[PDB]
Structure 1
Amino acid sequence: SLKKGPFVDGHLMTKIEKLNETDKKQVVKTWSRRSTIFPQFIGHTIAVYDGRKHVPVFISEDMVGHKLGEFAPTRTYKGH
C-alpha cells in the first residue's frame, strides 16, 4: 500500500467489527493472510492458515502495522 491505504482483510474486517464490536471473542481459525493487525482488532487470536492447521497468534500491541500473516511460520524448519 502507498497512500490509501492499509488493506484490511474484509472478512477479517467483518469479524473484527463484530468480535471487536463487543464481547471480546475467543480465538478461532481465520484463513485470510492479506492485511496486518488493525487498530481496533487487537487482543484477539488469529489461528491463521499455517499451511496445515492453524497457529494461535497474539493480537498484541507491538506489531501495530505488521502483517497478521507475517506472525505465523510458513516453512517447517529448522534445520539440519
Structure 2
Amino acid sequence: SLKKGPFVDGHLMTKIEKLNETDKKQVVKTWSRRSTIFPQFIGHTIAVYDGRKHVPVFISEDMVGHKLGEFAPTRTYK
C-alpha cells in the first residue's frame, strides 16, 4: 500500500544503517530484490541475488524509489 509508505526489509535496512554509522565501506549482500531504494542507500554498492549470483548494483540518486530487483535482471536473453 501507498499510505503505509515505501517498503524495505528490516534485515537489510539494519545492515545499511550500520554502514551509515561508518562511511559506506562494506558492501551488503542480500536476497531482498523487493526492497525499495531509500536515500540512505545512495553511494553504496548492494549485492542483490538475481536467482543464482549476486549482482553488484551501485546506488545513485535516480535509483531512489525503485526496487533493488529492477537492476538485477533475472532472465538472460540476447
TM range (shorter): 0.7 to 0.9
CA offset digits 1:45-66 (Å, max 9, x no partner) = 1111011111110111112201
Please say which of residues 19-28 and 35-44 is displaced more in the overlay. Answer: 19-28
Matched pairs, number:
78
CA contact (8 A) 1:36 1:69 kept: no
Give 1 or 2: higher helix fraction: 2
CA contact (8 A) 2:55 2:72 kept: yes
Give 1 or 2: higher strand fraction: 2
CA contact (8 A) 2:32 2:68 kept: no
Q: Distance in 1 between matches of 2:77 and 2:68?
A: 20
In structure 1, runs of 5+ residues without a counterpart are none
CA contact (8 A) 1:33 1:68 kept: yes
3-state SS of paired residue (1:4): coil
Please say which of residues 26-35 and 4-13 is displaced more in the overlay. Answer: 26-35
Between Structure 1 and Structure 2, whose CA radius of gyration is higher? Answer: 1
Over aligned residue pairs, what C-alpha RMSD do you find?
Answer: 1.4
TM-score, structure 2 as length reference: 0.86
TM-score, structure 1 as length reference: 0.84
